[PDB]
């Protein structure tokens, strides 16, 4: 049940072309689309497209997103990928491998809520 505005704004054919291109150009990184989960009470970020080292951990990526949204340490933040919260010890490369879509992007939503999308 994931809903990303990115997929409305950019058509699959062009997303896939970009994902192919960036995968080939940066073999040790993966392309990731990040958005706030629908209806969540967290700030939107200006940047939605992230080129992430494959060995960066999910936990390290959380730290970046938390910083960019200016969350206080005590504030909760959850990522959702295919409606599931990923483990912090996984690398972003592993998360990508198992979850990227057919356009070669991984889609990550962030939220203050522990359940996605409402």
């Amino acid at each position: 049940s994931m809903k990303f505005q990115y997929k409305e704004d950019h058509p699959f054919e062009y997303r896939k072309k970009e994902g192919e291109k960036i995968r080939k150009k940066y073999p040790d990184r993966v392309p990731v689309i990040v958005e706030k989960a629908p209806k969540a009470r967290v700030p939107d970020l200006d940047k939605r497209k992230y080129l992430v080292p494959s060995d960066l951990t999910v936990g390290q990526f959380y730290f970046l997103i938390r910083k960019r949204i200016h969350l206080r340490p005590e504030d909760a933040l959850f990522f959702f990928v295919n409606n599931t919260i990923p483990p912090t010890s996984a690398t972003m490369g592993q998360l990508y491998e198992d979850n990227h879509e057919e356009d070669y992007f991984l889609y990550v939503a962030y939220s203050d809520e522990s359940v996605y999308g409402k």
Partner: peptide
């Protein structure tokens, strides 16, 4: 529009 990727640092 078509933004550039953020190049996330290790």
């Amino acid at each position: 529009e078509e933004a550039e990727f953020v190049e996330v640092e290790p």
